[PDB]
Structures are given as structure tokens and as C-alpha cells.
Design a protein around this ligand. Structure first.
Ligand SMILES: O=P(O)(O)O[C@H]1[C@@H](OP(=O)(O)O)[C@@H](OP(=O)(O)O)[C@@H](OP(=O)(O)O)[C@@H](OP(=O)(O)O)[C@H]1OP(=O)(O)O
Ligand SMILES: [Zn+2]
Ligand SMILES: [Zn+2]
Ligand SMILES: [Zn+2]
Lengths: 48, 107, 143, 254, 299, 167, 290, 34
């Protein structure tokens, strides 16, 4: 029921097309570990 | 998917932007210490001062004009006051000019 | 031909000494409004208007608050008829906001990260001497 | 450990903590507003874009087109505020797109009911006494402008002109004392918290002399019936029944 | 189970148990105090309201009958867990009151640490101040001594300070932490007191009638600080067996009083853990983190 | 500008819409263009609604320029609203309009035959334009969601393309 | 349409500050290769550097294993042609319109069944990084990539915007240079990209050990040995690589002469060690003795 | 690849599902019946 109806909701909200545009979700924060490690890159931090 | 606090990220970013050094963000499973990354010696000599934190700087601020009496018809520069140490025209000169003509012909 | 008046009420009677300044200012606004869209630019063709607008309301802001040289009634008539700018003024009266360039340079929703123009950053905390031209107003560091 | 160390430590941490927990970035604080632009901003944008033929724009082309989907809203919002013949000029709040693509009048015309009926009743009397006592009425021409006369500019043509007295009826100073001044305003008592709710303009409350003059002024557009047994078989229920039985009373619908 | 709780809009800074072990209180940036039932599905019944600033520290009484809660808006508040309603708004603090502590088993009395430069003693009934030891600067954590006659405080100058309620002078000053202390919690021994400090080291002390004059007892490694400088808080177990700490590293650190070994660095969180709560009855752990939710770990 | 941008985006250079929103060819068109350049009821309903509003705002511009009068403006507006049938030609594209059209006739017979009850004559000067105005406003309340749907479909089809795959 | 969690970009192109702020736009542009709409992420590289944008689909990236804007390889970081050649790969991605759209559709359907962890296909079967690839690799971030363009105005004199000229107000590069015109499509497909040819010529002129004439010259001269090495250490350099027959550690010249038992073994050892046999920090020079 | 086209017949309609009430024949009764 859950998965079914959520996909329903997206497909029918397509059939809304007049989208009652809701606000953009709050800014997310993502923590990123590059594969290439090296002190000369990222000014020497192993994360961004 | 991190979730961090908001004043602090912008504080660190502006620090690294205008001062050139920053409290490195690596949250490692090996316990590293607070290390100023980037211009490390600049962080050392400047005492870690942030662009947001007030600090003593005798740096010569560029000279500007100030015409803020709004009754002069062509007087008010107000907030739009130009910098006094600014140029009045921007152009390339005789050698680079002919060289750029030569390049635009070569292209 | 002036800002033809809607009130039909008589102007209170300081109106006669601030009349000519406002008149020449409106002359200048009409003129810099029509100034046609040359090879100038498309972002900067609207910088005159904000410039002039600030001026006019700044002027009245003087003659009521910093000189006290006009009455409450005349000042209110001059707002009501669109010479001054009610909220640009009511913002000027705040503490960090003496020289605010245009009222849109503090609109947080008009910018994607949710901030103010670099117009609004104190010149010291940048210290890099870099020319700032807030695309909105054309101002160079309002404060 | 060094004291001045700890002192600039207190300095730094004080400033930091102070800004970080400042009331500005408290939890539910919502940024204040969007206040008005100057009018010349709109005027200049729209007179600049002109008719999008100069390739200097050439990107507002796409948005200009895509905004067609909403122009039946702009038209409805525009026509529902037109200025009502006792007025010469009406100023309206306008919401617009920063490229001039569209311009919605952003307002709803609330009116006080007895005021409104009295104003239109005065119009009734004036129009009638005028059409009776004018020698020859000239009817304007439709369309008023030709097929290839481009539309006028506001700024160059109407901006500074004087606007030609409207259809006021001239109210008598004694009997119509309670209304003579605010009668023909756009929204009459908009800003007087004795008689109106506020500046959103709901909720009137009036004095009984006000109501009596208003009544007498709107007397022309009114029914001089006092009760309901005039509509005996002429109300909603009589019509519902007649319709249901497919029989039709003398002067009623079929 | 893991039992993660959510329903808080911003960071939760403080989470603690009923001293019954019956109900749960958590609080943080959202300027209100949420309550839950610890057992069953860990469900939410009540929400206390009113505090305009951020709830920086909530503190129970030792029965669980009234609630103390230090707010950013210069005020402490005591409320009725019976109702959830305000009985007292401890105003008069001249700045950010971060820390609060109700006297346990003594007369009803409160010590509050604040960002004004004073520690304040207050009686709940008088609506007036009792005593106030202006040392120089911000005090970031405050706890009584089980005699209710000394008061311990930790701030920016790294020397943990203790005042005698009767002579009103700096009774006991202890030293050895390299940077600012962020948390004090005296075990239920009435003797052993736990100190977190963002210099990455945690320490143990003991306030007694007679101590070796340099009472830096046990030392553990592991805690972290970063550009956040969030307030980091520690606790003893009900037994004085395990110390629990949080840090800006997303790792719940569980150590032991005995062997000082790392019994746990548990992951599971997304943002910095600000407060860990031990169940007064069970081996139940509740983590309040800056990821806008909580965890209910069972060990 | 919107309608002209539409016309010229479809690459129909042989047509032009003049300033009273009449659509006129500037050549004689072969079959291929007589076909390529047919338009729908969305385009034409939008055209005709804009023509009604231009008639109205231009009556007001005549008032404000000094050309007419307050009374001539009022009566000309009353005229406009009573005679939408003979001025726009909207009924061609949504024929349900005659509801409205017949209504604005019925009202006119009321008002007129109560306006001129005495010495007042059968002449032009009767502008009491509240009623017809109301009528066309309710019509617009009804039509805006319809036209927004039809125009959304037209614009989508013009920018994405028509879907001939799984019809 | 694609939908991603973050870009997938070179550290050079991602910037210098540890703390970056980046904007996403859903279905924002069209992949210049995949031809379909993508989500487009835009970040400010550094102070006074142009805002960069991801310019190729996430699938068009995972397929050839490159950085969505920098376009250079992910591990080594050379043009796509160079990496392909060094991996000896033969990438068969179609070129014409219909065949390419069809290939893209099925490759995307099959990459849907992945883990999002490593490139699909031979880019896993070709990760044996050859010393040529490691040798051509960039070492530190060539952050000259993110400075702004050349001001047509300031090249003609006109950039009257003061110091704010939207482009580097320097000399325009002579258009005759091969390193000027490299269309995106070719640089992704690897067909006649000038930077690839210049870098390949550079790799061909790079020093590698030379082979001798005679099969019987099975003594290999290693020059620059030093007296911190042992004969057993030279063994461990050339012991399991095959068999060594003899070892002469010349201490009067600080060199070595290794007689092997298999010609191919010694050849692989010495060529693979050419100037890069770094044992105890000594630059030995592997060559075939007299 | 979702279109913004639309249909007259895809407007919302009959947006609530009727459920079989207590007396009509609910799955409870038919679960019971003989
Ligand atoms: O042209 P219509 O829509 O039919 O309206 C007109 C008109 O009204 P306008 O004044 O707005 O043009 C006439 O009005 P008067 O001649 O009265 O001034 C007149 O109505 P009368 O019949 O009252 O003259 C005439 O009608 P007819 O052709 O029968 O005279 C007719 O209105 P109808 O709808 O009545 O035809
Ligand atoms: Zn600005
Ligand atoms: Zn501005
Ligand atoms: Zn400004």
C-alpha cells in the first residue's frame, strides 16, 4: 500500500500539472570523502 | 548526509575565503586535532582572526569619495560613492593592442 | 506636468520651499528614465532609477529629521504623493541601516542562498579592496 | 597559561556566541517582508523590452511566450478593478514579472454595501438629468484607435495630463452633512478606525444619520415594498413547484 | 532495538530521564521541551512551552516533581511536571543563562551558570537572589556538592572553581585542563565529578573534606571539538561504572570508570551528539544529537 | 507581444496580428500554408478576450487624454458591455457565450425601459454599466481555468512536441 | 532524465576551500553526449574563479569513468584518449544519431542494475594502471583551469567595466595553436583531440630504458647504486622477477651488474625499474651491460 | 521525461472510494454467513 500509493501520488501530481508549487526543502548538508587523497589537494583536508 | 549548524559553516568558509586559512573540517575516525588548513603560517601569524570576528588591522583602506548631501542636483553620490583611488578608463595599450589585432586577424 | 496630485487637498505650507528641489529632481528622473538602452548593458540600465529614488527620499529624510525644517503634515503629504518612500525611510531609521542603497538589497528570498547583497557586508570585513557592484542597485557597499 | 591568551579568547568566543545565537537566526523568525518598488522600474523595463524584436533580449523570448498560460488571469484581475465613474484616477497594487512578461493587478475591490448602492443611485439621478438636458449626445467610436496605430505610451501621453472632471453629483451641505466629504472617495473611510475595521477594509460600523442620508440618496435604485406577501406565488418555492409540475404561473418562467 | 526518536525541529541539546525512569524530557533550539514515555514504543505525550530562547539545559529535581530548564533568553524556568506549567521564571540574569542545577536533598535552592560573568544562587520561593560569585567571566557548567554547601563551576579560563556557600570565597580551584571545560557531572557517590572539555580529554575529580590537594584522578582520551564549539556534556552511570560522552564526531563514547578502556565508540548518528542520558534503573542509553533527533540504545 | 511571439515562433511569417487583434495574411497562401497556419479555439478565444479588454482600456484612455467626457465614457462602456456580440466575435469559438449575450440583452431592456420612464428619450446617453460588467466578470471567472488548461496544452505541445508514440 | 546525489568531479575542479556551497537544478540542461536532460549542479570554485557546472550526464560519466565537468579521467587524470590507449582499451560507443540514442538507452537500462560504485564494463577490466599512465599523471592541482575567460572588450580595449571585466583582461591566445580548438564531443569520444596527441608525444619522448642488440648481453648495468645497498638487496630487486644468475655490486663505481637466467624476466625487471627502482631512496639507472 | 500535456478527462473526478457499508454486504457479514 505504501509504495504503491506514493508512486500513485507522483504520477497523478503529474496530472495536476498546475503544480501548487510548494517551497524548496531546507538546505541539505552533505559530507563528502573524495577518493583521491593528497595533501596538495583540498588544501590538505581529507573531507569536504 | 550530514546535518551541521548554520552560522558556523559560513563562519569557517568566509574565514578560508578572506583570510586564506580555516579550521579543517575532516571529522576523522582517527582523532585529529584542530589544525588550521590552507595558509597555516597565515593563521599562526594572524592569531586565527576570522573575517566575522572583529580584530585589529591597520591595513590601509582604499581611498573613496563621500558626497552625501542629497540636495545638490548632480551632487549626491550617497551609497553609490565611487572609490577615489579608482581609474577613469579601462583599456589595453599600444603593444598589447596591436598584438590583439594581430591575433584577431590570425583567428 | 508635475507629479499631478491626487489628494486635491491643499498642500501644507512648507511646500513652497521644497517645491523647486523636488521639481528639478522629477525632471531628472523623467530624463534618466527615458535615456534609451544604448550599448550600455541590460543589467545596468536600471541603475539610474534606484539612484534617483534614494536621492529624493533621502532629501526629505533630511528636511524632516536631520533639520526639522518641515512639518509633520507637509512631510506626510509628501510621502502620500509618492515623492518619498515610506519603508525605505522606515528602514533608514534603524541602527545598522543608515545608508541602505535600495530596498531590495536586503530581500532574503530574492537570492538563492538566503542572504543580502555583498552591498551589505561592511567594507572592513572584506578588506580585499575589490570593486563591489551589487547587480540590483549598482551601489558600492551601501554600508 | 598566558592571560592575554585567555582575554582574546573571551573576546573571540563572546563575539562568536553572540552572533551565533542572535535573535535574527532564532528558530521561527521569518524575514519581514517584500516592500514596494518604485513605479519607474516597471515602466522602464516594459518600455525597454518594447516588442521583443531587438536581439539584445532574445532570452526573455522564452519566458514571454510561456507566460501566455496566465494571461486570462491578468485580464480578469484587471477588469474587475475598473475605476467606477465617480472617480477620475484609481491607483492599484500591481504584481509583475521582473522582465515585464506579465502584470497582475493584485487586489480585490471590497466595497461597503449601502455606500456603494448610494453612489450608484446618485449616478442614476445624474445620468438621467444629463441625458434629458443635453442637446445632442455623441457616442464614441468603436474601436477608438485604428488597426495600425501603435498603442500610446502612458508616460508620454497620459502621465502629465489633467484628468477631466468625473460624474460627481453635488451634495447639499445641510441635509447631506454626514457624508458630503467622504462620499466619492475610492474606499471612503479606509483609514479611520472609528468606522472601519482597519486597512484591510472589512467590518463597517456607521451612525444612524449616516445611514439615513445614504438611504435617501440611494432611494432611486430601491424597492418601496415593506414585507413579503407581495411575492405570494412569486418566490423561490412557488417557482420550484411550478417547474416541478410543468405548469407556469402568469408572469413567471417556464 | 535502536529506537530512534524524532519530532524535534532543530537541534536537541539536552535529553534526560525522569529520576523515576518513567518519562523522557528533551529540548534544544526549537524553544520548547518535548516529553515522551521511555517504555512501550517510546511515545510522546506532552510538550512544554514558553521559553523564548533556546533550551540550553534541562534539569530535574531529585524526585521528579518540578522541572528546571535554563534558557538562552536570560532566564531560568521551573515548571510543574504535574502540569507542565510555569511556576517560576527566574529572571534577573544579566546575560545568557546556560546551566542550571537544583539542590538535591537540601532546601530547595538553585545554582545557575550564565554568560554574564556570575554564578547565581536562587531560592524558588522568594523571587529573589541568594548569592552570586562574580569571578570574572562566563561560567558554562555548574553543579552543587552533595552537602549543598560548595558550588562547582567550569568556564573559559580552564580552572574549575568551587565556592563555599558560607564564606563565599573561591574555596577550591583545580587546574590541568588545557582548554575550556564544557561539562561537569558529579556521580551519585556525592564524591566523584566528571569533566568534559573540548581540548579532547576528559577528567575525573573528587570533592572531599580531605583530598590529596591535587585531585586529578582518572583521564580518558577520545572527545573531539571543531569549528562548532558546541557544548559537550558528560555523565556518570547510575553505578559510577561507565562514563558516557558525546562529541562532534558522531560517535557515542562509552568508557568505564575501572579500566578506562574504550568500551564503545558507537556510530549511528548524523550530527554532533550533545548529550547522553543514562537510565536510573536500566542499561538504557538516550542520545541527543544535533541531527534533530534522538537515539534509544540498549546495552 | 505574446500572441505575436506565438505566431512567429511557429515560423508563420506570412501572417500578422494587427493592433486591434485582427489576424491578417500579408500574402495569398498556397494550400500548404492555408493548412500549416490554421489556429485553434485556444488561440482565438485568447485573441477575442484580449480584444474586449483593449476596447475597454482604450475607452478609458480616450477619457484620460481629454478626447471625450465623463458621460461619454460611461455610456460608451455601457455600450461595449451590451454589444459584445457585434464588437468581438467571441461566440464563434465558444458558442456557449450566448448565455451571457442573451443576459446582457435582458438587462438592457429592463434598465432602458426604466431609465426612460419620463421625458428622458430613446437616445444614446444611458450608461449604467454595472450590470453587464458583472455578467462578463462572472463569465471570466468561469473561463480562466478552461483557457489556462488549453493554453498550457498548446504551449507544451509547441515546446516539447506532440506525442505520436502511445496515443 | 537523470537524478543524482552530488556531482562526480575532479578535486582540481571541485575547488580549494574545504567548505563549498553548491546549487542543484532538476532537469536543467541536456547532456552534450547523452543528448537527454540532466540535473545540473553549479558551484563557485574559489575566490575570483568562474562558477563551474556539471556538463555531462551521470550515466555518460559512469560509462567512460570521467569527471562530469573536468572530463579528465578519475584516477590518473589524463584526456580520455590517453587513458584509453594506456589501458589498451577499444571503446565501442556508437556515433550516428539513431544508433547512438539506442545504445544510450540500453546502456542506461543496464547501468540501472548496478550498485553506483564503479564504472560499468571494461573500465573495471582495464584498471591495471600501466607505468606510462602513472608517469603522465598530474601531480598537484592545475588550478589555472578555473580562472575566467578572455575579455573581447579588454582585448579590443573596451572593457570599461573597470576592474570587474567579466574575463581575464590579458592577451588572447593565437588561434593557430593546436591546444585551442577541442570540441566537447570529440574530447568525450577521443577522436583527434590535440591535447591527447601532444601528451602522447611527450610520453614517447619520456625516458625509458633501452634494449640491447645481442641476445647474449644478459648482464644489466644499474648505475647509481650507493653503499647502503646489499647484494641480497639487489637480489630482492631482481630475485622473484624471474631468476638472476649472478650479481656484481661494483663498489669502486657505485653500480651493479646483474646476470639473469631469463631474458624476458630481466627485461621486464629493468624496464619496469627504469630510473624508478627506488630501494633505500637511490636512483638506479637500469641498462644492459656490455 | 514527464510531459506537461494534460487532458480534459484526467481532471480529478470521483475522488473518494465508496466502501461497502454495514448493511449492504460488508466483508464482515459475508465472513459470517451460512
Ligand atoms: O442594438 P441592440 O443590442 O439590439 O440594442 C439596441 C439599442 O440599444 P443601445 O442604446 O445600447 O444601442 C436601442 O436602444 P434605443 O434605440 O432604445 O436607444 C434599441 O432599443 P429600443 O428598442 O428600446 O429602441 C434597439 O431595439 P430595437 O431595434 O427593437 O429598437 C436595440 O435594442 P433591442 O435589443 O431592443 O433591439
Ligand atoms: Zn546589492
Ligand atoms: Zn541596492
Ligand atoms: Zn547598497
Amino acid at each position: 500500500r505504501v509504495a504503491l500509493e506514493k508512486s500513485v501520488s507522483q504520477k497523478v501530481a503529474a496530472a495536476m500539472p498546475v503544480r501548487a508549487a510548494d517551497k524548496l526543502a531546507p538546505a541539505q548538508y552533505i559530507r563528502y570523502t573524495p577518493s583521491q587523497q593528497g595533501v596538495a589537494f583540498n588544501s590538505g583536508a581529507k573531507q569536504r | 548526509p550530514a546535518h551541521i549548524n548554520d552560522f558556523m559553516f559560513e563562519q569557517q568558509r568566509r574565514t578560508f575565503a578572506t583570510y586564506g586559512y580555516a579550521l579543517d573540517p575532516s571529522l576523522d575516525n582517527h582523532q585529529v586535532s584542530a589544525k588550521y588548513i590552507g595558509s597555516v603560517e597565515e593563521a599562526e601569524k594572524n592569531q586565527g582572526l576570522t573575517v566575522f570576528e572583529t580584530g585589529q588591522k591597520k591595513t590601509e583602506k582604499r581611498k573613496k569619495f563621500k558626497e552625501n548631501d542629497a540636495s545638490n542636483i548632480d551632487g549626491f553620490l550617497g551609497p553609490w560613492a565611487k572609490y577615489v583611488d579608482e581609474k577613469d578608463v579601462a583599456k589595453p595599450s599600444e603593444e598589447e593592442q596591436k598584438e590583439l589585432d594581430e591575433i584577431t586577424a590570425k583567428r | 506636468m508635475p507629479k499631478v496630485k491626487r489628494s486635491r487637498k491643499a498642500p501644507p505650507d512648507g511646500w513652497e520651499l521644497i517645491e523647486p528641489t523636488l521639481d528639478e529632481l522629477d525632471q531628472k528622473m523623467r530624463e534618466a528614465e527615458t535615456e534609451p538602452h544604448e550599448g550600455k548593458r541590460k543589467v545596468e540600465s536600471l541603475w539610474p532609477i534606484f539612484r534617483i529614488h534614494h536621492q529624493k527620499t533621502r532629501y526629505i529624510f533630511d528636511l524632516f529629521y536631520k533639520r526639522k525644517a518641515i512639518s509633520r503634515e507637509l512631510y506626510e503629504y509628501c510621502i502620500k504623493e509618492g515623492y518619498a518612500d515610506k519603508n525605505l525611510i522606515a528602514k533608514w531609521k534603524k541602527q545598522g541601516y543608515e545608508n541602505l542603497c535600495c530596498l531590495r538589497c536586503i530581500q532574503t528570498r530574492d537570492t538563492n542562498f538566503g542572504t543580502n547583497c555583498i552591498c551589505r557586508v561592511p567594507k572592513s570585513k572584506l578588506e580585499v579592496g575589490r570593486i563591489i557592484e551589487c547587480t540590483h542597485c549598482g551601489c558600492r557597499g551601501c554600508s | 597559561m598566558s592571560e592575554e591568551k585567555l582575554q582574546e579568547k573571551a573576546r573571540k568566543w563572546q563575539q562568536l556566541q553572540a552572533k551565533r545565537y542572535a535573535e535574527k537566526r532564532k528558530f521561527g523568525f521569518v524575514d519581514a517582508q517584500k516592500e514596494d518598488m518604485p513605479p519607474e522600474h516597471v515602466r522602464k523595463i516594459i518600455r525597454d523590452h518594447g516588442d521583443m524584436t531587438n536581439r539584445k533580449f532574445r532570452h526573455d523570448k522564452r519566458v514571454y511566450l510561456g507566460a501566455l498560460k496566465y494571461m486570462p488571469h491578468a485580464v480578469l484581475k484587471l477588469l474587475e478593478n475598473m475605476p467606477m465613474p465617480w472617480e477620475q484616477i484609481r491607483d492599484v497594487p500591481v504584481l509583475y514579472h521582473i522582465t515585464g512578461a506579465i502584470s497582475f493587478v493584485n487586489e480585490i475591490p471590497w466595497v461597503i454595501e449601502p455606500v456603494y448602492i448610494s453612489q450608484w443611485g446618485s449616478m442614476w439621478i445624474m445620468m438621467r438629468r444629463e441625458k434629458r438636458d443635453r442637446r445632442h449626445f455623441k457616442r464614441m467610436r468603436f474601436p477608438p484607435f485604428d488597426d495600425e496605430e501603435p498603442p500610446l505610451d502612458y508616460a508620454d501621453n497620459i502621465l502629465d495630463v489633467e484628468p477631466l472632471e468625473a460624474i460627481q453629483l453635488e451634495l447639499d451641505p445641510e441635509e447631506d452633512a454626514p457624508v458630503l466629504d467622504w462620499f466619492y472617495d475610492h474606499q471612503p473611510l479606509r483609514d479611520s478606525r472609528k468606522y472601519v475595521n482597519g486597512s484591510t477594509y472589512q467590518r463597517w460600523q456607521f451612525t444612524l444619520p449616516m445611514m439615513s442620508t445614504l438611504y435617501r440618496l440611494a432611494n432611486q435604485l430601491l424597492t418601496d415594498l415593506v414585507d413579503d406577501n407581495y411575492f405570494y406565488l412569486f418566490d423561490l418555492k412557488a417557482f420550484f413547484t411550478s417547474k416541478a409540475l410543468n405548469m407556469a404561473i402568469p408572469g413567471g418562467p417556464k | 532495538p535502536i529506537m530512534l526518536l524524532s519530532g524535534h525541529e532543530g537541534e536537541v541539546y539536552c535529553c534526560k530521564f525522569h529520576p523515576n525512569g518513567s518519562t523522557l524530557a528533551s529540548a534544544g533550539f526549537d524553544r520548547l521541551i518535548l516529553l515522551w514515555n521511555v517504555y512501550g514504543d517510546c511515545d510522546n505525550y506532552a510538550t512544554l512551552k514558553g521559553h523564548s530562547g533556546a533550551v540550553m539545559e534541562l534539569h530535574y529535581n531529585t524526585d521528579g516533581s518540578m522541572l528546571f530548564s535554563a534558557s538562552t533568553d536570560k532566564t531560568v524556568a521551573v515548571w510543574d511536571s504535574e502540569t507542565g506549567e510555569r511556576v517560576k521564571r527566574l529572571k534577573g540574569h544579566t546575560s545568557f543563562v546556560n546551566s542550571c542545577y537544583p539542590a538535591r536533598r537540601g532546601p530547595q535552592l538553585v545554582c545557575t551558570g550564565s554568560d554574564d560573568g556570575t554564578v547565581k544562587l536562587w531560592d524558588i520561593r522568594k523571587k529573589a537572589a541568594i548569592q552570586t560569585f562574580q569571578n570574572t567571566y562566563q561560567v558554562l557548567a555548574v553543579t552543587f556538592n552533595d552537602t549543598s554547601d560548595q558550588i562547582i563551576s567550569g568556564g573559559i579560563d580552564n580552572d574549575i572553581k568551587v565556592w563555599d556557600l558560607r564564606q563565599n570565597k573561591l574555596t577550591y580551584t583545580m587546574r590541568g585542563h588545557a582548554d575550556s571545560v564544557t561539562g561537569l557531572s558529579l556521580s551519585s557517590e556525592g564524591s566523584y565529578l566528571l569533566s568534559n572539555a573540548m581540548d579532547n580529554t576528559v577528567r575525573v575529580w573528587d570533592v572531599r573534606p580531605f583530598a590529596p590537594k591535587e585531585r586529578c584522578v582518572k583521564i580518558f582520551q577520545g572527545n573531539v571539538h571543531n569549528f562548532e564549539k558546541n557544548l559537550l556534556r558528560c555523565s556518570w552511570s547510575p553505578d559510577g561504572s561507565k562514563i558516557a560522552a558525546g562529541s562532534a564526531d558522531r560517535f557515542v563514547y562509552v568508557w568505564d570508570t575501572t579500566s578506562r578502556r574504550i568500551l564503545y565508540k558507537l556510530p549511528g548518528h548524523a550530527g554532533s551528539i550533545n548529550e547522553v542520558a543514562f537510565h536510573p534503573d536500566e542499561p538504557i542509553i538516550i542520545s541527543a544529537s544535533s541531527d534533530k533527533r534522538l537515539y534509544m540504545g540498549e546495552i | 507581444n505574446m500572441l505575436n511571439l506565438l505566431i512567429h515562433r511557429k515560423n508563420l511569417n506570412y501572417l500578422h496580428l494587427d493592433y486591434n487583434f485582427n489576424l491578417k495574411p500579408v500574402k495569398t497562401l498556397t494550400t500548404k500554408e492555408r493548412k500549416k497556419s490554421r489556429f485553434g479555439n485556444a488561440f482565438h478565444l485568447c485573441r477575442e478576450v484580449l480584444r474586449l479588454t483593449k476596447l475597454v482600456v482604450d475607452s478609458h484612455v480616450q477619457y484620460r487624454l481629454g478626447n471625450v467626457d465623463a458621460f461619454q465614457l460611461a455610456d460608451g462602456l455601457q455600450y461595449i458591455f451590451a454589444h459584445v456580440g457585434q464588437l468581438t466575435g467571441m461566440y464563434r469559438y465558444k458558442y456557449k457565450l450566448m448565455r451571457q449575450i442573451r443576459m446582457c440583452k435582458d438587462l438592457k431592456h429592463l434598465i432602458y425601459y426604466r431609465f426612460n420612464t419620463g421625458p428622458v428619450g430613446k437616445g444614446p446617453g444611458c450608461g449604467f454599466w454595472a450590470a453587464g460588467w458583472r455578467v462578463w466578470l462572472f463569465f471570466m471567472r468561469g473561463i480562466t481555468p478552461l483557457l489556462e488548461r488549453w493554453l498550457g496544452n498548446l504551449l507544451a505541445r509547441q515546446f516539447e512536441g506532440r506525442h505520436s508514440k502511445g496515443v | 532524465w537523470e537524478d543524482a546525489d552530488f556531482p562526480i568531479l575532479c578535486q582540481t575542479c571541485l575547488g580549494e576551500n574545504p567548505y563549498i556551497r553548491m546549487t542543484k537544478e532538476k532537469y536543467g540542461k541536456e547532456c552534450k553526449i547523452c543528448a537527454r536532460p540532466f540535473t545540473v549542479f553549479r558551484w563557485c570554485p574559489g575566490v575570483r574563479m568562474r562558477f563551474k557546472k556539471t556538463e555531462v550526464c551521470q550515466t555518460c560519466s559512469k560509462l567512460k569513468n570521467v569527471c562530469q565537468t573536468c572530463l579528465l579521467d578519475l584516477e590518473y587524470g589524463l584526456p580520455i584518449q590517453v587513458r584509453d590507449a594506456g589501458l589498451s582499451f577499444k571503446d565501442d560507443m556508437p556515433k550516428s544519431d539513431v544508433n547512438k540514442e539506442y545504445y544510450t538507452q540500453n546502456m542506461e537500462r543496464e547501468i540501472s542494475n548496478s550498485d553506483g560504485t564503479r564504472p560499468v564494463g571494461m573500465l573495471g577490466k582495464a584498471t591495471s594502471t600501466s607505468d606510462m599512465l602513472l608517469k603522465l599523471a598530474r601531480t598537484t592541482p592545475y588550478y589555472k583551469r578555473n580562472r575566467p575567460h578572455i575579455c573581447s572588450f579588454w582585448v579590443k580595449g573596451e572593457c570599461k567595466r573597470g576592474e570587474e571585466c567579466p574575463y581575464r583582461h590579458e592577451k588572447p591566445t593565437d588561434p593557430d595553436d593546436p591546444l585551442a580548438d577541442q570540441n566537447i564531443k570529440d574530447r568525450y569520444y577521443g577522436i583527434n583531440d590535440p591535447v591527447a596527441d601532444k601528451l602522447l608525444k611527450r610520453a614517447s619522448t619520456m625516458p625509458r630504458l633501452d634494449p640491447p642488440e645481442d641476445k647474449t648481453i644478459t648482464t644489466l648495468y644499474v648505475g647509481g647504486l650507493g653503499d647502503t645497498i646489499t647484494e641480497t638487496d639487489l637480489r630482492n630487486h631482481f630475485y622473484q622477477f624471474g631468476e638472476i644468475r649472478t650479481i656484481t655490486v661494483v663498489q669502486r663505481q657505485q653500480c651493479a651488474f646483474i646476470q639473469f637466467a631469463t631474458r624476458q624476466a630481466a627485461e621486464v625487471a629493468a624496464e619496469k625499474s627504469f630510473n624508478k627502482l627506488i630501494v633505500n631512496g637511490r636512483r638506479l639507472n637500469v641498462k644492459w651491460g656490455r | 521525461q514527464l510531459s506537461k500535456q494534460y487532458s480534459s478527462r484526467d481532471l480529478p473526478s470521483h475522488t473518494k472510494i465508496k466502501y461497502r457499508q454495514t448493511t449492504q454486504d460488508a466483508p464482515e457479514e459475508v465472513r459470517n454467513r451460512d
